[model samples]
Target: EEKAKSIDQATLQLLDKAKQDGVETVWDRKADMKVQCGFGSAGVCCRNCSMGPCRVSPVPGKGVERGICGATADVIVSRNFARMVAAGTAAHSDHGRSIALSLYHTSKDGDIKVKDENKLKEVAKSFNVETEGRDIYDIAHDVAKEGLSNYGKQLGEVTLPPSLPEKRKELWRKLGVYPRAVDREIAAVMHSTHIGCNADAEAMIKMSMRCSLTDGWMGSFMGTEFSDIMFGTPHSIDTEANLGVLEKNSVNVVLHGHEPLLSEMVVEAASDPELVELAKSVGADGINLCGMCCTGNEVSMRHGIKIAGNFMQQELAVVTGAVDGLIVDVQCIMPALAKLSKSYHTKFITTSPKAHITDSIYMEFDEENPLDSAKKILKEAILNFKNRDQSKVMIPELKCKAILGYSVEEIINKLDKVVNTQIGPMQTVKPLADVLVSGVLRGAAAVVGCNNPKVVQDSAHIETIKGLIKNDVIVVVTGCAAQAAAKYGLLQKEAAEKYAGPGLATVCKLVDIPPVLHMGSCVDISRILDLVGRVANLLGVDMSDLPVAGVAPEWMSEKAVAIGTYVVTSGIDTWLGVAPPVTGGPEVVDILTNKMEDWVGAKFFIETDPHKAVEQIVNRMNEKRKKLGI
Candidate 1:
């Protein structure tokens, strides 16, 4: 049986193609469009103070009316934007905080060994912490202890790598825009947005960017550092995208969320012979476990585990009715899952002790004995397969082709291999300069953030990517940005021929890769930091030396803030669309715009116009090239 479609025209075309190609999917069959609201989607409805849900809208003839709190259209817009920054930063930073805690425990006393020591040292060097000849365990323990403290530090600023350019640093210091501390910035934003602190839209956006600085430079950066310390940097590992990657004959188990603590262990347990034998006992083929979201990228990039799908793909994945067990740790999970599972055979299992639901069975996961816990969870899920109601199955053929697991490390290696052996070796960015000046490497652009259905679904991503690539700007994409491209077949080599400039087209042929490189999901924007590191290392200068700039045209998460912060602080300027709430405070706004680069290395720029956004990136790339004397 087929289900109704849930996407707009463009997505519908892609979805239709995916169906024609026999791709496995779930979302089109489950989405209820009538329940979707435009006002809430744009985030104009405010409930923070509750004098009322102050609905700010454009009057029929007149402009926007004042709310109970006297908030105008701009104020409401800024508040909504600031809240998104706050909430987005909180989500990712809190995740970083959790990782720090876990790392601290492992450093003190845990059986999990640090498999890659060089990475630990690399991370240590970035943070300016010494690890020379020190025991890897001790160094990690020290780093974790130091990292965890950064989240709550009340005295000094967060301890992160100094990746900014000297000039940028000077600029930030002059403007007094440097983040004092992570917790402090978050607090300030909260206080400023409350009752009646700062209401100017532009000022609110400015302060909002500053607050985001804490996340980008501090929180998300911490995640990248710690994740590298723990999981090792991602490389060019081949993995399939969409639901078709699932083994039809095997018992498919899907793990969803941003955390790897449980999902990683679950993968280990599912791979065990005991679990395989158990599958045999159930008269089913062996287990085929895959991932979704950041956690999916984490496992998929490293182990080549199939990425079942991402974010919005979750509910749809379950709707396929092909999955025997759906395990979730935390984040990006739909609340409607409980009811959905009641109608299908897919067992909804909540694995995180921190995350539990009313309808799902709770199988608490402990990382210490993760494999064992995973076995037990899989066993329970497998047992439920016999009870599946086949009548409720509605798996759609909807998906895309994506070349995932492209890490900063992998990009550097590819650059070294392609540039040195193919193009010739050089110790400085000067050689890369030849590529830019000679019009080979050309310019680079980063397309990132979420999917907005209101807009042409994936149009912003597709167009932005096409425009950048066509202009000879090498595109680095993450989050739904990559997903949007994947849907449009941009990751394929043919995309380069069709969309790239002559110079970039030649380089694409030499590299034999996509002009738009998938740098993992949003939190993995830390991967972009690592990418900068490799580029800097290859260039023999600071990160700012590279002809690269960050862009998030369709961003909607605080993790984006954290990601953007670190990127700018890394000496790369970031351009974000959809104005954040920083414009409410001129003092704070001025600081972010005029001063932030000094402390962290870069600052945020908000551009609502798409054409303007691309122009900002082009200008910054040229500016960086000129600064590097390339």
Candidate 2:
């Protein structure tokens, strides 16, 4: 028999039910695929070309020392690593490209109009579009075109955000890693990784950083900004999370992917008068809209929609046998969902052309007429409500109330309440900087990224965050990591009183936020960067001088890899719960863990133990604080 798993009580109950019903889970699949190849795990095996699918010894001066192409272990590892960066850059940047296209399609009469015209003007100015006395649509068109231009712009550099520190920009320029264009940098990595091209490990690593920078400062930045412009900027909101959010009495429609385009429309469509009646007609109380993964993060923050679960829980949500329909778009979606849904009455639907699974129903999301498309999908779910097998329906009665949606603008507005400016501006990050300087808040930590089955799901995220808040380090979260915090009650207001240090608790009570701040989806990590850059500029210090760090405990995606590299490149020490695949090359490992600090003023720290990881992070922050004489 399989042993009971998950730190989450709700998940444990669901796993028990799944096992009793003969359903296989991600953990089961992991068990079946046991003993992963050590060479591939260490990133030494390469099949880049037909010359040879090669393997190199992870040990120094040992067997299979080089590939058939005469590539050393360093070359093989770096190449493999660089390709991961390339793939991740492509995923996020391509999502940005789609959003840019959607923005371009927006018109006064179109299905998508500018929701935040003021933000449109502000962003337009940054894109060099003339917003003075011009119509909003005209400015929006120009800005959208400019954003679209960023993907393939041939001549000039990708437009870096004005929020980036000038000194940091100079550093990037000096190191010759400043991104030229989003697609250009991604393509460059692919080209360099091709056989017989770039062989130097350091050069490959540098190129990966450049490509990752494009995702952070350009591609993913555009995704966040344009999303806010289309859907209003998120503010403080209360919500709930976990599989327990699934409503058996209602027609449960779970939005389970990254992009907000379709999910946002589904939110609107589910509230339609006719659809609610249709749900009632199908013997359900009403249509219940919940979210999964980053799409869950997006809607949960903006609309206060309940979250069903995060990355690993996608399949488990279906296993509850209460989910009427699972609608997915792209990224982090498991194909196992197709087969899993067959065992239940759930309608598995794929809406994006970019992602499709075998044995799943395909409902193409038409951005030009998004509402109509979303209404159709919702109708399908409503009709499926009657098909739910009551005998199998079992939703664990466990969830926590959470306060989410702390955008950068929202954070600044809240911090303004703590501002003691009797003379100058009332709204600024000075209050936050002052707190850090005075050592009231020891430092800031961004606990971000996904849940990996490789590690105990949600254990690393909760343990690390609990330690940070207790030690007076203010914590912010994004992605699946945010969901984990929400699941564990860390995002509740009482968590500040129950777990936080005196200093952080005081700030939390004054600001009326949870000890752990929910900052939104993965791409919104740009918001974290923006907040840090502002504080660094206020102090006239490099980002590395600040007593701040980022941790991605239980990360399992190429996107997480890209995020880690970019966070380090932006001059923040990042701790990883799961070690990356660079162990095959000692040179590559040294360059990432040590030498990277010389280049970017920050580096990676890999530790699997959550408590030990937080200790290291606290020590590093203390070292930086001492250097700043705080």
Candidate 3:
């Protein structure tokens, strides 16, 4: 009966194991919660200025129609949604900042050095930095300087929007939402949404869009690009996913957060000879390092590290009685894990200065001595291996083989392979455009974002993706949705044969890629934007001209909202498997689902059920194709 909670056999088995072991999981907590609060769920509960902490019913005139400040449900909902964008932008943009700082600190002999010099040069051109005859490091430092300035610069526009199509750039500038600076745009939203500043719901949504675009096109965009320079760009790599990747014999250390600055070093130190010997002495086969969350995406893409699981699977990884250490940096981390890990032999290690839980072993990761810090963390996990209670271990036999690491560069390279080499340029989206034009592929969809307790674990992600690819809409994925696809065999080459329609299967077989492409972390959704924009440009059109859509089937984070806003703003029709909190305000809902298309050429669609959601996606693709006259 509990099997309905998740499509995964292991997740269901672990829920039963958790009950028998007298341990309560998120599912138990969900049951305890019974029902989520209506006012909060409706986004009508306003705490701005703490004026009675007002509440309004979703139904106007049913109870309270306005807040203490006379803020209607639309204003409250719009303000709430805007703040979510700010917080989510801050989180993703913070990740961008850290990577930029790392880039600034890069050295020839330092722990972080430039790996993709060509990528650095490519990015440097975006900043108008001369790359003719300067020392590579000098160019890197200058590029990093220009990159960091996008956060707080007071005038002009962010340098990263150069990647956008000329038409979209004109659109953003014309609409006046073109971001001047990253933090400034976010600060503008926060300031305007404060107490009695920007009251108009439509204008509030515009500010939210501007701030989110800063996060997507600038902050997170820089994060992915600069990360590639420091930590080599991801190529198509083989890996595995799920709780079964956690070895029973090896000392397991789960990289559980968003930053590659930390996880990259942890991954490197995991292979250290001294650490391996220490692991052996402590009675582990070797230090088995896997990943969780976006940290999983970072490592699994760059290092071929097996993924332990996604957001929901974090607890499942801990409860397996196998994780020797669960190292976290920031975002999507559950404080409950600190308590959960202590119950097992798992050392709950907190790495980020921003995210220290009460019970976590605080290890301030030394940026100057990153390798040393990583080794220290790995050693703790290695030493704790002896404490793992083998008797309590209930290792599941259900990991799936996955092919990940299809960065935009890799995708272009793979596409080059599918066509005649002498016909055109070495790297181009022409072939991909031709596929769409020739009716071989109906459209493209990005099924990204995190997991939510509201839906069955991995169910919406799989069903939505299965439906899309089955209709020959090739899917690009990031974050938890990616792991969900990997867990369900959608990220393997065979997935094309099994799940994709005839056209998509042919493309996958020819391109040597899975039907669902793993671009990178949530931040790397920019890569999808980049790839799509390039395709649109090649076809002499805007991004909205393509039959492409975005979906976040199990998203439950503020970052997902920021992502959705930026994605829709980028001219892709985005679908949410779960309804956002703006449902109480009919005005806000109409603006998001309908009015948005008039302004940005794309809109948001909400469908709680994935089967219906899939049908809707296929129809949207058909509509776009008809417009394209394809």
- In terms of lDDT, the poorest run of 10 residues in model 2 is 1-10
Name the lDDT of candidate 1: 0.67
Q: What is the TM-score of each candidate against the true structure?
A: 0.81, 0.98, 0.98
Candidate 1, after superposition: displacement of residue 337 in Å? Answer: 2.0
**Which wins on lDDT, candidate 1 or candidate 3?**
3
- Write one digit per residue (lDDT tens) for candidate 1, span 43-67: 4556769697776553323544666
Q: What does candidate 3's lDDT look like per residue over 1-630, in tens digits?
A: 554788899888887888777877787788899989898998888888967688898997688898888889999999999999999999988899888888888889988899999989989889999899887888899998999999988977579745589999889889978777889988998999898888898999999999999988989899999999999999999999988998898888888999898899988898899998999898888889999989899989998899888898788888899988888999999888888876788899998888888978998899888999998988888898989899999889989999999898899889988778576777887889999999999999999988888999899999899989999999999999999988888888888999999999999988888899999899999899899989988888899889999999989999999999999998999999989998899899999999999999999999999999889988988998899899
lDDT values for all models? 0.67, 0.91, 0.90
Poorly placed runs, candidate 3 (over 4 Å): 1-3
- At residue 612, what lDDT does model 3 achieve? 93
